[PDB]
Design goal:
heterohexamer; A: 254 residues; mainly beta; DNA Polymerase III, Chain A, domain 2; Proliferating Cell Nuclear Antigen; 2 domains; 5-stranded antiparallel sheet; 4 helices; 14% helix; 44% strand; globular; D: 10 residues; little secondary structure; 0% helix; DNA sliding clamp PCNA (chain C); replication; pcna; proliferating cell nuclear antigen; replication protein
Chain lengths: 254, 253, 257, 10, 9, 14
Amino acid sequence: MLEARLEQASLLKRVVDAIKDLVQDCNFDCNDSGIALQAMDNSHVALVSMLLKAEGFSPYRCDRNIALGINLVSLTKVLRAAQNEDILTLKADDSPDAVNLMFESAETDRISEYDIKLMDIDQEHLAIPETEYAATVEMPSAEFQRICRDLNALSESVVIEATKEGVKFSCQGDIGSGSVTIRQHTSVDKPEQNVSIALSEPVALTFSLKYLVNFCKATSLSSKVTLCLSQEVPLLVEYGLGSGHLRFYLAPKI
Amino acid sequence: MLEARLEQASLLKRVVDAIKDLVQDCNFDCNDSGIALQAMDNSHVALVSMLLKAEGFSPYRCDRNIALGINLVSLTKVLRAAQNEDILTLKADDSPDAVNLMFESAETDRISEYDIKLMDIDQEHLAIPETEYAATVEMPSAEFQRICRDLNALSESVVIEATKEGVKFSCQGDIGSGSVTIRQHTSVDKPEQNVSIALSEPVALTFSLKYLVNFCKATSLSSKVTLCLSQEVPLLVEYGLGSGHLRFYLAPK
Amino acid sequence: MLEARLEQASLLKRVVDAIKDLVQDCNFDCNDSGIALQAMDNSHVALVSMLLKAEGFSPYRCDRNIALGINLVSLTKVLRAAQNEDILTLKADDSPDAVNLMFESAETDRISEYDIKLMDIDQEHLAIPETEYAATVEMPSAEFQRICRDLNALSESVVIEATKEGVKFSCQGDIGSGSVTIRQHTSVDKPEQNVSIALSEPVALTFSLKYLVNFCKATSLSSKVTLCLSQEVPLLVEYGLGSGHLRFYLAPKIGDE
Amino acid sequence: TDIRNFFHSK
Amino acid sequence: TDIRNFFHS
Amino acid sequence: KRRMPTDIRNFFHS
């Protein structure tokens, strides 16, 4: 019924590690598109939107649409038993009581198999309206993670101000104030430290640093992160997965 | 008089780190062959059997049979004060209340000296019979440790099944079930990841993963581990020391 | 005003990490010679004496004498936001309510800028006299750190005995007794393991191992540490910063503990 | 503060 | 359960 | 509170 095989298991390992601390139990909706996920945290403050397109699996085969209700802590415990370079095979029958994961060793003739009992999750699906953002910032994911951790040590809220010149992350706390200003940057041989600002109108919004630090647990998935800002819409933090995406939506502090 | 000198102190450090979390207070029985240890855990489910042969000590001199009753936490605190590549000298009188430990640095002309007070431990000696095991598995110690920790995250018990094809470690829990199957594996390039299975009779037994994870704290002692199984005897997990051995015996569930 | 820039922030981060766990709130006294610090711990058993010479900053500019009262935990949180390979600029106004720190990336145009609110701290400065010590020991700082940690696992107090043979650190505890004896080790091929013992009179004093372990948080500042001892004077544990120094003074233990 | 103030259900 | 059912005292 | 004997202020003048 459902088979999705990852050529290197690392991807799923990182994907689950980028999600678990934000949302506990989730539905993996599998269809002809691949595997999608939409989940709000228990706050109802942020929203995870993940798409793993059929392109990414060795054979991807989904005979019928299926929702796999999985506890992400259990899935993390099962995925920790796989090596980054193992061959991962996910399978599920029609009307499944469990999801089957198989990890195949590259070198040795070693085979691991796990069966995770599925969950019944009522999730209330939300409609994402395909938004045009006033400001779009492309930056190194590790630099954004460092900024978020640094400012989170001082405060609970960060102001992101996007202009044509660059982006300014600022905060205020008991210690005092802090700011990191990044500028529009191009490099030829080393493009891992590039910063792009596509802007039609300056934006300035305030966000929870705890949620941004949780979002930055996706840093291992890509060397670039995209921040999308506009008034009256939530912030979009997007990590490209290669034939898919992992997106976090965060409502501003009002 | 007893003097036993180890060329690299790391060995004793790792042995005590491999024993302390399973058994706290232990007797080191010292005789002409070397330093032996036999101890059960407090719930009496597992048994530690260690032999440090005189061959491994540069001068070994044990004039009389003697029992050094040591608290392994105190010994660990003292042994942490030695470097991995230090020279260790253990000394004791014939009627001792304490043991003398000396750490000599190879390069710098540094000498550390400690006197550890001994304790009185009532000796539980058990007779371990000359067993012919139905299954004998030689595998990478790090792989066995990884399997044990992985499955211990999922369950409390592991079924070890040794058959003609290979060895299967299986477990069941509230989350679900899991299994890791290893096969006969010889390689000519990287031989540290070799797996040998000598089988005369298929075996299937159930064990506590907590105790196996505690056993795997001896991983630092050897790159290979040997598992010895039979339907009616306890599991043997053995780590070679070169000049001796460290063995864990686990009663099945 | 005050402006002083370090080409590599590492030093200040390291310096602050060697002091914060011993003393939290302190005044940084800035003048034409540079940035100095003298602070006692809350129990008044140890004393930190730091000098960061103007030599170490490429532009150093201090127009008037200024005392920056800083909470070292806050400063540590701010300094954690600097990379080891950043350009650090410390700044202060004439009548400052805060101190300004700037971290500039070497590669890229990235600028991090922080303002730490200052504190009102009355510092009780002591006159530390130019002493000629009976014993002076130069040894690897990491070796001294291991000695202190090892003996702290067994006891609360260490007896330091400096004689012509060498220097011996001994302790006694519930587990038993222990001692580490070092002798000078006149040079090697790899000279990071040298031990120097300059002695004019034997010394024997008892010290708190907790305070010495806290002192050894300066191990990251230099590969060697200097111990200075004399009967009836405090122990001096010194780490060189090059164009500056960090010194710890510890009063000997006098009790029945 | 609620994310569902920006995203309509179903 | 109980290692001592296999090894005589 | 009195100063205790282990106190660097017993060793260094004001």
